[PDB]
Amino acid sequence: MGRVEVRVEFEGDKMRVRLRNDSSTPVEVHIKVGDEKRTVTVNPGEEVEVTFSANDPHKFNRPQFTIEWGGGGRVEVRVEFEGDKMRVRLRNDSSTPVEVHIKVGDEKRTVTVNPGEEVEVTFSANDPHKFNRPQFTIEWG
């Protein structure tokens, strides 16, 4: 087994990314929020928070993170907040299939991404403020 949690939090001109590693191995999470690109190592049991800042809160409309882990594994998560919906693309560039759980207020979506596969997850909302604190869990077999 093994779980990796990502929570994105929008608070005005700030965007916090909290990462938990609930797995047996250390992960390296590559974040790219607009022009800014940060990389962090999250060790098992560790919780890491990286805060991003912006002039325009539309720099935050396409956050992207790659949970990479020792032994070439990559899980790519690209978020896209366009209009009334939040679009998420998940790509499993690992040999194990991963299960991805995304929560956004009242709605929670779960998909399986098989190795080499790339799946889309779109949420709709009336108030785009429903996407202010989205969560992502990646559990491997």
Author numbering: 0 to 140
Task: Give sentences from the paper.
Here, we devise principles for de novo designing single-chain Ig dimers with interfaces diverging from Fvs, as a two-domain Ig architecture that is hard to find in nature and optimizes folding stability. We envisioned that de novo single-chain Ig dimers could be designed through two-layer edge-to-edge dimeric interfaces, resulting in extended Ig β-sandwiches.
As the seventh (C-terminal) β-strand of each domain was found to be partly disordered and not present in the crystallographic dimer interface, we reasoned that the C-terminal region could be removed and then generated single-chain dimers of 6-stranded Ig monomers connected by a short β-hairpin loop; overall building a 12-stranded β-sandwich (right). To this aim, we removed the last nine residues of each domain, and designed a short loop connection (between 2 and 5 amino acids) between different anchoring residues (W68 or G69 of one monomer with G1 or R2 of the other monomer) by Rosetta fragment-based insertion. We selected scIg12 for experimental characterization and, as the three scIg14 designs, was found to be well-expressed in E. coli, soluble, and monomeric by SEC-MALS. It had a far-UV circular dichroism spectra characteristic of all-β proteins and was stable at 95 °C or 7 M GdnCl. A minor deviation was observed in the conformation of the designed connection. At the bottom, the designed linker is surrounded by a tightly packed area stabilized by aromatic stacking, and at the top it was found a cavity binding a glycerol molecule (as crystallization component) that is surrounded by the two β-arch helices (insets).
